[PDB]
Amino acid sequence: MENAHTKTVEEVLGHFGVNESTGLSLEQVKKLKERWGSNELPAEEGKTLLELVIEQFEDLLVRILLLAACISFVLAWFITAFVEPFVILLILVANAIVGVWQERNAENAIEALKEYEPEMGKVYRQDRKSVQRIKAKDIVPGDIVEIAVGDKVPADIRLTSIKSTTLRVDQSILTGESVSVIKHTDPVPDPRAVNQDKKNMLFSGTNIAAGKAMGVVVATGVNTEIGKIRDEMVATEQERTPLQQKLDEFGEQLSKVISLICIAVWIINIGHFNDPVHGGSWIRGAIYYFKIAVALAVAAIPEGLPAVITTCLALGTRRMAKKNAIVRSLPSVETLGCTSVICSDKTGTLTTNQMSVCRMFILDRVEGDTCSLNEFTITGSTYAPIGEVHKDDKPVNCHQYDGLVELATICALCNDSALDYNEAKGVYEKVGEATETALTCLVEKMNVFDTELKGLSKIERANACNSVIKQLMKKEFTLEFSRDRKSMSVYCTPNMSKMFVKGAPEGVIDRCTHIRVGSTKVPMTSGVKQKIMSVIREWGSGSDTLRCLALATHDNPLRREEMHLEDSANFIKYETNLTFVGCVGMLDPPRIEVASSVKLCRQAGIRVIMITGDNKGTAVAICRRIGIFGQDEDVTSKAFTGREFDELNPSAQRDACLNARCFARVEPSHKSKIVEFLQSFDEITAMTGDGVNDAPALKKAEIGIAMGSGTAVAKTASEMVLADDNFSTIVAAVEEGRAIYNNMKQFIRYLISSNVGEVVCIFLTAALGFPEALIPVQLLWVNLVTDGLPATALGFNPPDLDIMNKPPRNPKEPLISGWLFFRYLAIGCYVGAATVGAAAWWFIAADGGPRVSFYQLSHFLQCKEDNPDFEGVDCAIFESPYPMTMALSVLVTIEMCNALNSLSENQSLLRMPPWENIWLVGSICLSMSLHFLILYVEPLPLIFQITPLNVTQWLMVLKISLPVILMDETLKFVARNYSWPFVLLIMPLVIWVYSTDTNFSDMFWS
Ligand code: BEF
């Protein structure tokens, strides 16, 4: 049963075989529960933890470490060789559980921000003639449902009859409309009307606001409007976050490097196993040089890279949680740092979705045919009665204003809504209509009777001032609102007997024939009528767009005996002459943090767009208010509707999404079409929103931010949830996503620089013929411990000063540039020659070591030979740990100096001293003290074939290590062009180390 809005209530009730008087029978209900099922949406599938770790291995970087560990395992099968593949598996497993523990922790925080109040419904079934309250899931299409004020709609209902005079429904959840909609039972002929044009339909998820009505259910479960939208959110595809796309692009670059050094080492060693060795076949000799080349490629892959990447994201996600921001995924904490466009819903997201009175005026002075108006302003933005009234922007008390004392009397009495406080969530709510709760919240702010509010708690502070006025004036029968008169009045007697009327301005003021100037009753003239009406047009038509409501009273009404409370026409006949008292202005006001945030986002180069389902009047008026538009800037080509964007040319649609900042009256499917167009322009789009009309857009975007007050369907599609409804947290999230990305490039270069330095060392050791300086067991401790501590501390780098004053990064540029590749190639070639040059120095030029020649070292496998050229050298000295602890200490000391100049990308170490990052200087003292731990404890100098040094050897380590700082400061200088307490500290060190004279004395090749 679709398009039930187009059919009359007779044919809709006839289709289900149901009568409104009696209702559905038990035999029809179980029959319909078979065909249709439960009136509930399928619960979102929390994926198995075993399937959760599967996406933790979808990353390309961890797949390279799996292939590296799987390769290193089979080469060991042909137990210290099994140590490296075993710890790589633990690193990948411990890294995967942290990614799973975060997404599991993020969930438990989001579903904690949910009100699991049981959803019920009041149906009319043939079992009992009276109404019965059943569960919502036990409702089937065809049920006659009766829902009154304050009740949530259980299912899609076709209205059959309105029991009250008018029915008002709050549909901001599904349509984004800020104002309550009036409903009728007459059919809407258009078979493809939008949910805002179906005025004879009650959609599920919405709530009634004013009256009482009955209807027949036409859809349940996934057939409801919230069900069709949720099905659309599931149908949308989810692309990878831009950080995962950068890391994967770097993963193909890391793969092309290790594949080159594996192919290069192989081909330079080809034609070289035809030697008289245990070969015999070319196919058997290409296996030997393959096992040494692939072992060299695996040694180029940084083992601890994804583990320090996860720590940087997990430490950042913890920083957003303190700002009341729940991030589902780890890579989604960077997306806002590269966001170009922020698309934002208006109702509930940019505004509070809570009607607030912010302007009111009464009469001050009337000399003749002209007057002066006392104009006030109120500061509240929510339903909480926490506000202050300001006259001439200075705090004013409304006690000495007799016109304000009677203005609050009409506002408190004439409305029939209320303001309750729920300690469960801790926020005040509206009971009836939103515009009548705005009057209730106003009366509490302007304490006209100066009641004592210090001792009262939150529950009675909601209706403290209102109940006072009710005690002064008891409420008799009410002349309720009629659409033709467009006004509402009440009858009240003191504990005389005035009549209070409230309605549209021009409708009320025209009936008014007097003015309440303070305490006097002054006859109103057409001159002062034009002035107060001019202020109404100032509030209605200006950029200060406000819903205006005129408040008046009747000093001499005839008694209840002569009243006829059955005719709409006589209602305007009982309030013919009234006394104009004042007028109030209310709107759905933007959140207090939204105004400054669109300004901070503009400096950061981020463009904010309003994509709302409400009309372009309210949409543009809030755009001018928050700062998206100027108070006088025209929006002819910058503000579109859902329709006006449909009949736009594709060429005109291009500069629409590129130059338009407001989109009004758009369907839930339109919101994701706009997000899709913005990503077609290659932009990282962030969607902020609440309600069901935003769920497809929240998923389609690169990152979707939901409000804590939003719906559950909205928080499901979103990657981030603002728990406290703080729009400033989005600006703080952009600043963190930019610092994390900057710091991520720092410890990515630092880590791949350390591995290329170890590859050049092993390659150079093979070409020169020297004994092995660095064995793979100590290359594991270096990359994990001495490299992991400074790389983790590089995530704590101080953020730039112009970090939020520059455009977002281009999504095409990679992590490692072409220049940054050469820059870490230079570092890698240094550590290769430094570590080999430090082991060779002990073998050739050191005092304590044997002073063998280069020939006598290139052929160290021929020493126990009788006496070819090895006259007096021992063969055991070629297995000595002293040249191995020389190359390990230089490697560790260079990485400490390379972590020191990885504090900034281009800024020098004099301009940015190392104590800028106190975690970096503290982690270096830890990696260096853990290196001295390996040398002097009992068992570890045997696990690593190394030995403690002396001061003469340790001074040589620094002479080889320190020039890596001069080498990078030189590249930093080139990168830029194309303090004093720090200098006076390093200078005593540089002169003390370099005062001694020493050489390497490698007369041969290198
Ligand atoms: F909730 Be939005 F204004 F569509």
Ligand SMILES: [Mg+2]
């Ligand atoms: Mg909304």
